[PDB]
Structures are given as C-alpha cells and as structure tokens.
Amino acid sequence: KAMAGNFWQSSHYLQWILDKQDLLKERQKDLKFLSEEEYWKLQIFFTNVIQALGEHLKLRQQVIATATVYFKRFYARYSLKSIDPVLMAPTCVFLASKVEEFGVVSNTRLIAAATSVLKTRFSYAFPKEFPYRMNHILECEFYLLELMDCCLIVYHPYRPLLQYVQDMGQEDMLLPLAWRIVNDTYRTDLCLLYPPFMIALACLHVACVVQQKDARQWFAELSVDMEKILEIIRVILKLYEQWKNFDERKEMATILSKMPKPKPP
Amino acid sequence: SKMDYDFKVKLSSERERVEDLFEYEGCKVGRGTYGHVYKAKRKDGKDDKDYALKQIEGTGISMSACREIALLRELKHPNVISLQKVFLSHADRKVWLLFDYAEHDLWHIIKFHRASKKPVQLPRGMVKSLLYQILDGIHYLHANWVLHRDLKPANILVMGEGPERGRVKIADMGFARLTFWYRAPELLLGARHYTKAIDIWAIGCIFAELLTSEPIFHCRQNPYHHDQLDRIFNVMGFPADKDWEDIKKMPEHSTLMKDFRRNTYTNCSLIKYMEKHKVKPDSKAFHLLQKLLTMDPIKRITSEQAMQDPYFLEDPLPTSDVFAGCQIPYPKREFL
Numbered sequence: 261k262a263m264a265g266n267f268w269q270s271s272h273y274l275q276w277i278l279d280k281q282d283l284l285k286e287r288q289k290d291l292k293f294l295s296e297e298e299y300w301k302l303q304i305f306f307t308n309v310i311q312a313l314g315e316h317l318k319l320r321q322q323v324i325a326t327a328t329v330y331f332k333r334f335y336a337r338y339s340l341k342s343i344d345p346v347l348m349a350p351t352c353v354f355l356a357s358k359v360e361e362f363g364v365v366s367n368t369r370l371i372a373a374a375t376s377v378l379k380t381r382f383s384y385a386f387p388k389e390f391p392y393r394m395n396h397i398l399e400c401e402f403y404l405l406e407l408m409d410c411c412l413i414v415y416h417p418y419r420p421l422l423q424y425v426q427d428m429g430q431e432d433m434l435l436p437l438a439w440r441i442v443n444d445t446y447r448t449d450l451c452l453l454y455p456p457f458m459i460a461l462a463c464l465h466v467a468c469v470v471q472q473k474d475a476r477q478w479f480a481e482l483s484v485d486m487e488k489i490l491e492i493i494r495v496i497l498k499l500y501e502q503w504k505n506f507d508e509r510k511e512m513a514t515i516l517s518k519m520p521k522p523k524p525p
Numbered sequence: 526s527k528m529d530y531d532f533k534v535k536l537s538s539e540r541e542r543v544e545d546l547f548e549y550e551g552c553k554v555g556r557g558t559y560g561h562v563y564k565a566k567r568k569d570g571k572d573d574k575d576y577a578l579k580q581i582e583g584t585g586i587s588m589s590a591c592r593e594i595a596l597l598r599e600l601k602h603p604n605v606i607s608l609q610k611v612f613l614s615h616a617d618r619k620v621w622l623l624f625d626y627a628e629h630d631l632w633h634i635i636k637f638h639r640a641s642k643k644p645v646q647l648p649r650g651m652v653k654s655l656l657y658q659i660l661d662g663i664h665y666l667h668a669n670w671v672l673h674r675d676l677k678p679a680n681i682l683v684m685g686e687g688p689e690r691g692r693v694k695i696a697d698m699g700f701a702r703l704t705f706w707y708r709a710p711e712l713l714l715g716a717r718h719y720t721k722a723i724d725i726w727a728i729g730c731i732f733a734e735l736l737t738s739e740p741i742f743h744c745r746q747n748p749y750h751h752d753q754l755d756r757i758f759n760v761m762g763f764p765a766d767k768d769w770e771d772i773k774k775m776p777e778h779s780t781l782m783k784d785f786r787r788n789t790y791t792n793c794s795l796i797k798y799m800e801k802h803k804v805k806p807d808s809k810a811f812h813l814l815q816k817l818l819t820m821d822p823i824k825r826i827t828s829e830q831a832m833q834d835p836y837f838l839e840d841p842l843p844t845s846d847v848f849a850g851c852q853i854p855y856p857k858r859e860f861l
C-alpha cells in the first residue's frame with residue numbers, strides 16, 4: 261500500500277515518463293540489426309517470457325507488472341546486446357519480488373522456474389537449455405539497480421482502474437475485460453510514456469466499446485485531456501492488429517538470431 | 526554470453542566509487558549486522574555539508590535493503606530522513622547508503638538531561654517543537670500508507686549546525702529487524718497486524734519522556750510480556766470495559782485475565798503519575814498526551830488531529846529549529 265497516492269511526486273513520474281522522441285532516438289541503435297516490426301515482436305516476446313515466469317512462481321500480477329516495467333526501462337536506455345534479455349527477465353522478476361514486498365524467491369526456485377519455463381513453454385525459441393546460475397542473476401541485479409537509479413516503486417493502471425469502474429458503478433460487468441486490456445498494454449511502450457491513470461482510462465474506454473456500453477456522459481464529466489487518452493486508444497487498437505499478424509512461435513527464432521548479441525573479451 | 530564487454534568497461538570507466546568521491550574517516554558506529562556508518566565529507570569543495578556513509582554488512586542486496594532503498598527513494602518530507610544516493614561496488618558486492626548527517630538524536634539529548642548532577646527539565650519550547658516535527662513526519666508517512674513500527678527516542682534524529690539547524694528527522698536504523706517501553710498495549714496482548722495507531726502510542730511515550738525526562742513505561746528485563754503490561758497498568762491504571770470494549774477480542778485476553786486482577790491498580794492513573802513529575806493536569810500538554818496515550822487503539826487520536834491541537838496554538842509556539850536560537854550543549858558523535 262506504500263506510496264499509493266504519491267504518483268505525482270514519485271520518481272516513476274519524475275524520472276521514468278520518457279519522451280517518445282528520446283525513446284525512439286536511443287532505440288535507433290538496435291534498429292541496424294533489426295527492423296521496427298521485429299523489435300516490437302521481441303519486446304512483446306519477453307513480456308510473455310516474464311508473464312510465463314511469474315505465473316510459474318505464483319507471483320501476483322503487479323509483481324509481474326513491476327518486473328515487466330523494469331525490463332522495458334533497462335532496454336529503453338541500453339541495447340539488446342548490453343545484457344542478454346534471457347538473463348535480464350528472471351533478474352527483473354527477482355528484483356520485483358524483493359522490492360514488491362512479496363518475498364525473496366528461493367534461489368533454487370528462481371533458476372528452476374527459469375529453466376522449466378523456457379523448456380516447457382518456449383522450446384520453439386530456445387533449444388539450448390537455460391544456461392545461467394544464481395551467480396549471474398546477482399551480478400545482473402547490480403547493473404539493473406544502477407540503470408534505474410534505484411527507482412523501484414512502480415505504479416500500474418490496476419489501482420486507478422478499480423476506482424474508475426467502481427465509482428462509475430458497474431464494476432462487475434466491465435472490469436474483467438478492462439483488466440485483461442490493461443494486461444495487454446504491457447505488450448507496448450505505454451507504461452513508459454503515460455501515467456497509469458490515463459492508460460487505465462483508455463483501457464476502460466475500449467472495454468465499453470467491446471461490450472457496447474455507452475459511457476460518454478461519464479467520460480465527458482471527467483476533467484481529463486481526452487485528446488491524450490485517445491492516443492492510447494489508438495496504440496491499444498494497433499496492439500490488436502499486431503496480435504493478429506504475429507505468429508511468435510513461427511517467427512521468433514529467426515528474430516532471435518537477428519537480434520545483436522553480447523561480445524566477449 | 527551474458528553481458529557484452531564494451532558495455533562493462535564503459536560502465537567501469539564512468540561509475541562512481543564511494544572510496545574516491547568521499548573522505549570518510551569518522552566511524553560514527555559499528556554494528557553486528559548493520560555494517561559501518563561514517564561521518565563523511567565530499568572530496569570536491571562543492572559543499573561543506575556532512576553526510577553519513579553506511580556500508581551494509583552483507584554482500585549482495587538484502588530484501589530489507591531493497592525495501593529500505595525503495596521506500597527512502599520516494600519519501601520527500603523535511604521531517605523524514607533523506608537518502609541522497611546509493612553506491613554499489615560490483616567487485617565486492619557491497620552497498621553504500623548516503624544520508625544527510627544528523628549530529629544528534631533524542632536518546633542522546635534526553636540522556637544528557639540526566640547526566641548533569643537529578644534531572645533538569647527540558648525547555649518547554651523545545652518539547653513542543655520536538656513533538657510537532659515528530660507529528661509532521663509520522664503524518665506524512667502515514668498518509669503514504671507507511672508504518673514505522675519502531676518509534677522510540679533513538680530513532681528521532683535532530684539536525685545540528687547547518688541549514689537545517691534543529692530539525693527533527695525521523696529514521697529507522699533497525700529496519701532489517703522488522704525494551705518494550707514504547708510498544709502499544711494491543712501488541713502486548715497479541716495483535717497480529719501493525720497499525721497507524723501503534724505509532725501514535727509510541728509518539729505519546731516519547732512525549733511523556735520529553736516532559737518528565739524519564740521513560741513513562743520503563744521496565745526491567747512470546748508476544749505477551751506480563752511485566753511490561755504491569756508497568757502500563759501501574760502508570761495508566763487498568764482499563765475498564767467501557768474504556769476498551771474490544772479488549773476481550775484480543776488473543777491474550779485470557780492470559781491477561783489469568784495474570785492480573787484489576788483491583789491492583791485502583792489508585793493508578795495518568796493524572797496521578799503526571800502529577801508527581803510536575804506536569805499539571807489542567808495543562809494543554811497533558812490533555813493532548815492523554816489523547817495520544819489511550820489504551821483502546823481506535824479511541825487514540827491521529828497524527829493530523831494532534832497537529833491540530835490547541836497545545837501548539839498556546840504559547841510558546843513551535844519553531845522550525847527545535848533549539849530556538851540558543852547554543853547546542855549536547856556533545857557531538859564520537860569516532861571509533
């Protein structure tokens with residue numbers, strides 16, 4: 261519950277709502293090896309590797325959200341070859357569990373979850389076998405804190421969204437779908453560009469469209485720059501168009517070879 | 526493999542080492558498990574301000590260390606301690622925390638007010654200001670849903686000479702943990718969740734100590750600590766059913782029923798205790814403290830309401846500097 265209503269003063273807002281232009285600028289570095297469409301698919305894919313990871317450890321969604329954000333933050337600044345994303349993702353999950361008060365993941369449990377989930381659910385991408393031990397996780401943890409400048413408290417659309425559907429007054433008919441659409445925004449850069457209240461409002465709006473409810477009254481009563489939330493709507497619809505044309509299990513492996521790799525001494 | 530080399534060396538030619546950025550001899554404290562704390566000065570002439578360098582005892586990043594770093598990293602209130610940076614040595618995986626350095630604290634300040642002889646009463650104005658800043662800091666925390674859970678004079682720091690002269694800073698130097706002199710009664714009766722109210726009880730304990738210079742619930746040396754409860758009852762009296770109706774709901778109420786007979790504390794009350802220590806029962810200060818020191822936790826007033834008390838509207842008025850403009854006689858911290 262800590263710092264729940266401090267977001268306007270948080271380091272999240274004060275140091276991690278980045279400008280799209282800087283994001284795209286620093287992203288030019290990986291674009292020499294990869295295409296724009298492939299990059300998205302790559303970061304979609306590691307969101308799915310983190311989701312899968314936290315699912316196996318029975319971690320609550322916001323622990324898994326914070327870990328996904330940790331990942332997006334790191335590679336928003338540094339290249340895909342800086343640290344192997346296969347090491348980064350379990351490290352993010354590991355840092356989130358501690359930070360998120362959930363509880364240190366058993367050292368045996370973290371490596372076993374890594375190992376099993378690539379084997380079981382991602383065997384099309386990795387035929388190798390998970391290669392890293394607790395030694396590497398702890399080394400990578402230090403690079404992770406350093407890069408984030410130790411901003412570890414992260415805000416997500418789930419809390420504002422509950423307030424919205426509850427205070428709008430049909431909580432049970434809208435929230436399951438809207439919650440899923442919040443889940444799905446983590447396939448995108450939204451968590452880096454907009455406050456979670458705006459994200460949450462755009463996710464509510466799509467859920468109403470899907471269920472055909474007309475909440476125009478309610479929305480126009482809110483004092484929020486609609487032109488901003490409408491950008492998010494377009495991203496989320498672009499998200500669903502992307503999903504249709506993406507066959508991760510048939511595409512990811514060749515994209516994984518394309519992606520730049522760490523160089524030795 | 527795992528990490529690219531060029532990225533490692535660049536980070537290893539740009540990163541900052543605490544050993545090269547600070548002059549740190551002034552070992553303020555050493556501790557079985559909390560590492561070492563030094564009184565440090567920037568090696569650049571940029572600022573003359575003092576800092577505390579804490580090296581955490583364990584290697585790696587503790588969970589206790591994670592939550593502390595993440596919390597302190599979001600807290601901005603003049604009356605809560607400030608974390609200025611974190612230094613991570615990747616070679617020896619050690620962690621360094623840098624805080625703005627507090628020369629004083631309430632434990633040492635109160636102790637000095639009994640080392641000079643019988644106790645010398647603390648300046649009333651200092652006591653008001655001390656409590657006010659403690660109520661501002663805990664309120665801020667509580668309003669961010671942050672519970673301190675170990676409020677006691679040693680945790681209240683006071684800034685010394687400098688631009689925050691005499692300003693209370695609330696800390697938690699045994700955050701890795703989580704005398705029962707400041708523990709609220711419900712904790713002693715087996716309560717299983719920490720509360721905003723438990724903090725308020727500890728604030729009142731501190732308040733009584735500032736007024737009387739003694740620890741109100743001081744006691745010789747299981748969730749249930751019979752002898753500590755006996756000190757509360759000896760000071761406060763035993764609570765009536767009307768005073769704490771849900772006390773029956775406590776896990777240890779049966780033990781309390783078996784170990785105590787309320788008739789023992791017939792002549793016991795806060796009025797009666799506070800009278801012996803020259804605090805008058807009609808004062809504004811006594812009434813407030815009675816509001817802080819309430820047995821039933823949900824009858825205990827909140828930090829925001831206490832700041833709203835007429836006590837702080839009476840004369841003298843609280844100052845940003847608890848030391849008014851006068852000279853600070855308390856000794857500075859010794860090195861080891």
Ligand SMILES: O=C(Nc1ccc2c(c1)Oc1ncccc1C(=O)N2c1ccncc1)Nc1ccc(Cl)c(C(F)(F)F)c1
Binds near residue numbers: 596600672696698
């Ligand atoms: O308070 C901390 N850390 C901290 C604070 C002070 C010092 C410190 C660590 O290092 C030490 N370690 C062990 C023993 C002594 C010291 C010491 O001498 N310290 C010091 C002394 C004088 N000047 C500056 C610093 N963390 C924290 C966690 C959670 C919360 Cl909620 C809160 C709060 F919100 F309640 F404030 C605070």
